[PDB]
Symmetry: C2
Subunit: 146 residues, 2 copies
């Protein structure tokens, strides 16, 4: 009779994906905001460059999506990176899209070494080929939920 | 080898990007869904944990619920006043917190929604791929906190 919500031991919760996702995400996001605090290229500014670096030219609605951010906040953090010279505006079709500038690449490239090193500690000593299974699963899950 | 995330396929294979996107989807859905039961993911998280754990200090509720002892202490105080929890005493004197009869019945009344959301979330993944996914996420975390 598999365990169903609500779970009845500490060990059952330990196998409930939605609980695991959050303890680990609070953990990644916690250790990184305070190691980023140094460069003070905040998670806000980090997330958005990361997404444009990956998808190329994005709308602000799209940035708030990939970047897991509110639409207004995105746009604020976007006018920053523009005025700080890290991204610029453009327009293909016609609504208001954002792009990465050469200034923005380099900024990324600089923090990059830190992000990776955190990834490696995160993953720690997990089996590689099981960490491939896990990230294909999670990638399948994010496809079916949007 | 992959870091410089210059592609979706690469980003979307970055565990902390998946971990973030997926986490946000789940709690916004449930917070929203349960908004009439006034069970936003905070209050629900704690009760969830009280169910699974049994008796936690204001402090273990903080860890498990990824919050600050004050905000938790406040989340805890809504639940004692909504009729879903009770501040108790350890079998020593560390200030702990349990579910009530109404609180227990509340997660019970709620469960079809959560398990339905959970079925939605992790539904059509190969069940063995999923078990592995779960083992790994549990491995990864153990190594960080041990609680």
């Amino acid at each position: 009779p598999k365990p169903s919500f609500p779970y009845g031991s500490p060990g059952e919760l330990n196998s409930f994906l939605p609980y695991l996702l959050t303890r680990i995400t609070h953990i990644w996001s916690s250790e990184l905001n305070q190691a980023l605090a140094s460069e003070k290229l905040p998670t806000p500014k980090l997330r958005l460059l990361s997404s444009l670096s990956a998808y190329g030219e994005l709308t602000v609605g799209q940035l708030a999506t990939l970047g897991v951010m509110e639409q207004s906040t995105t746009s604020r953090t976007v006018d920053q990176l523009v005025d700080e010279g890290l991204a610029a505006r453009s327009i293909d079709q016609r609504k208001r899209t954002v792009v990465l500038t050469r200034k923005g690449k380099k900024k990324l490239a600089e923090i990059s070494p830190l992000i990776n090193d955190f990834h490696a500690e995160l993953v720690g000593n997990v089996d590689p080929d099981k960490l491939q299974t896990c990230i294909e699963v999670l990638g399948e899950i994010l496809k079916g939920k949007t």
